[PDB]
Amino acid sequence: GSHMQIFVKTLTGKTITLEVEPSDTIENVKAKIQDKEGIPPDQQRLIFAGKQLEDGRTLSDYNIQKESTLHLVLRLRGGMQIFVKTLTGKTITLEVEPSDTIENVKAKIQDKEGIPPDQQRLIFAGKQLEDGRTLSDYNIQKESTLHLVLRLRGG
């Protein structure tokens, strides 16, 4: 038989043991994990020696041998806190969801600090965030820090 054993380490300490074929795609492995642990494949990110694995490629493509160990990172969903740092040294705390727009987020800042959204520029990972996008568009994560820049305004 060409089947073989591999291990999938989760970030909760649990190690999942799977039976696979070198010809199995990453897609198949995620379905095996769902069958075993109930985790939907759309939340699964599989990693081997630091490299993220693509759904349409095989264990063989990645040189994943018998007894190999993969790590499982989960995509987080639902409500979360983010932190917004100002030039004056303030850290504003916001309750948000990945689907909130940048427009929504600026409105939440206005509710907390009275700062007009048109005066706000939000920065994440060095990038200015554009109004019609969502937090998830920029891959913004739970407890991340954003930087709030205040434009010059005439009032």
Place this chain on the structure above:
Amino acid sequence: GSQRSSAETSELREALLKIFPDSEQKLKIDQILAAHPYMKDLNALSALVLDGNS
């Protein structure tokens, strides 16, 4: 709502290096931890490593 203590940051750094062991990843991990001092969730930190949001 509390910035990580040095021990909390060390614990997350050591866990991330096990997952992301290349020399370039080591630098990006440190830059991400420094940029986001409230992050305590290893999945969320891993997302920033995986999608290049350093």
